[PDB]
Design a protein around this ligand. Structure first.
Ligand code: B12
Ligand SMILES: *[C@@H]1O[C@H](CO)[C@@H](O[C@@H]2O[C@H](CO)[C@@H](O)[C@H](O)[C@H]2NC(C)=O)[C@H](O)[C@H]1NC(C)=O
Length: 378
């Protein structure tokens, strides 16, 4: 009802190639990219094989609940036995629970990914965990996250459709109800322009909407959203391979639920712009900061990361560390104080007062932008 117009296909093909082309021996092995190219039908068979091998050999002790889920699905989409990882994931999940009943919505993202994976390998063995998961989700009150909601509906839809014959005890009722719940919250996060939540959460939301068993009261204009996406691509919004990985499936009319059905082997300085960069902190382990600066970055371009690099050059001791992930460079430490996920604490970036929608290697700061780095919690 809202496929990509065969006229815009070249556009989709292009980003697919951009995304596959990012796979290299040093590149961070991204399971979402593998899933995406496999659901789309891979172009570059060497990149396909390389990534598949990097994941087959990933160490189970290096992966988080969500990594694990993603990696199990990626291998499966490459028609490779995940073996070991599913057992490991199953037991970690029987041991999972949120930090509290007021835990942030995104706390559920990884677990959603895991349940989806486990659901694909053995639905019945996953009921216990999924029932518990649905109840925990039903009980949470935090402000809604579309990305998480999307993942959660996929996982629950997977279960919803695999209710064991004979085992007829409101499991369907529970999952259906929580799904209805989430769809209502996903809808109503739907802008008039077609965006759902935000651009980088729209791809996942499209998968969820095309797959929940029960739509929301307010109808969703699918075409309006896919058209908005195509235009966004044409404006250079999807240059991040991970961002391509999250919309490609939708653009090809597939979702993570199609993974099990994948067919394999198919037939130093200054310049022109000056930015104002503040770094902050307020705390427990004391050590409070609050120091500004003005940086001279090139043209516009020199991503917001050049700003941080030059600021470290002036050496006001406020240097930093960066850590690699599926989305790119994450600023993990500033002036000798790291993120530490145990304390649900990290560095949040913002323009003025509003948080950035892109990372430091992607964002392009304007004229005299005041970009702050508050060390908050989530
Ligand atoms: C949870 C979450 C966070 C938490 C992470 C907790 C944790 N360490 O587990 C925290 C609060 C730290 C965070 C921060 C930010 N995030 Co965030 N985050 C998410 C979310 C909801 C789920 C990710 C996840 O757990 N995936 C499952 C696991 C298993 O996969 P993973 O690959 O291992 O996940 C890792 C990465 O996703 C990484 N990560 C999280 N956010 C970001 C952002 C950037 C720019 C990068 C490079 C990496 C990164 O954290 C995980 C640790 O490895 C996503 C949604 C999505 N679509 O991906 C948004 C999302 C990835 N985040 C986003 C953004 C923009 C940010 C920030 C730049 C916001 C800001 N500060 O202004 C900050 C940047 C931090 C910094 N200082 O560099 C955007 C990215 C858009 C883009 N880059 O084009 C997304 C897509 C949300 C959206 N729809 O807008 N995030
Ligand atoms: C920067 O970070 C601080 C602390 O993380 C934020 O201040 C908190 O504001 C919240 C409001 O949601 C209060 O409940 C907390 O008590 C405050 N924290 C502290 C340390 O007292 C501050 O608002 C953030 N600045 C932004 C987003 O511009």
């Amino acid at each position: 009802s809202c496929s990509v117009p065969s006229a815009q296909e070249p556009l989709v093909n292009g980003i697919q190639v951009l995304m596959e082309n990012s796979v290299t021996s040093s590149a961070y092995p991204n399971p979402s990219i593998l899933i995406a190219m496999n659901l789309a039908g891979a172009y570059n068979l060497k990149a396909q094989k390389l990534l598949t091998y990097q994941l087959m050999s990933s160490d189970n002790n290096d992966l988080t609940i969500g990594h694990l889920g993603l990696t199990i699905m990626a291998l499966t989409s490459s028609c490779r036995d995940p073996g070991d990882k599913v057992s490991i994931l199953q037991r970690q999940m029987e041991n999972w629970a949120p930090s509290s009943p007021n835990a942030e919505a995104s706390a559920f993202y990884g677990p959603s990914l895991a349940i989806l994976a486990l659901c694909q390998k053995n639905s019945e063995a996953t009921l216990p965990i999924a029932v518990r998961f649905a109840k925990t989700l039903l009980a949470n009150s935090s402000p809604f996250n579309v990305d998480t909601g999307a993942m959660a509906t996929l996982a629950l839809t997977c279960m919803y459709n695999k209710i064991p014959v004979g085992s007829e005890e409101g499991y369907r009722s529970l999952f259906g109800q929580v799904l209805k719940d989430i769809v209502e919250k996903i809808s109503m996060k739907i802008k008039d322009n077609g965006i759902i939540g935000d651009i980088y959460s729209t791809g996942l939301a499209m998968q969820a909407l095309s797959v929940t068993p029960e739509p929301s009261k307010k109808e969703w204009n699918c075409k309006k959203t896919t058209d908005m996406i195509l235009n966004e691509i044409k404006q250079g919004k999807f240059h991040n391979p991970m961002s391509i990985a999250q919309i490609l499936p939708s653009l090809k009319g597939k979702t993570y639920l199609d993974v099990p059905q994948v067919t394999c082997s198919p037939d130093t300085s200054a310049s022109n712009i000056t930015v104002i960069y503040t770094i902050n902190n307020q705390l427990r382990g004391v050590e409070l900061l609050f120091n500004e600066t003005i940086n001279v970055s090139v043209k516009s371009g020199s991503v917001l990361l050049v700003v941080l690099e030059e600021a470290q050059r002036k050496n006001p001791m406020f240097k930093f560390e960066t850590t690699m992930t599926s989305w790119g460079l994450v600023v993990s430490s500033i002036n000798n104080i790291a993120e530490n996920v145990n304390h649900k604490t990290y560095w949040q970036f913002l323009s003025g007062v509003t948080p950035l929608n892109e990372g430091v290697a992607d964002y392009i700061p304007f004229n005299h932008e005041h970009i702050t780095a508050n060390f908050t919690q989530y």
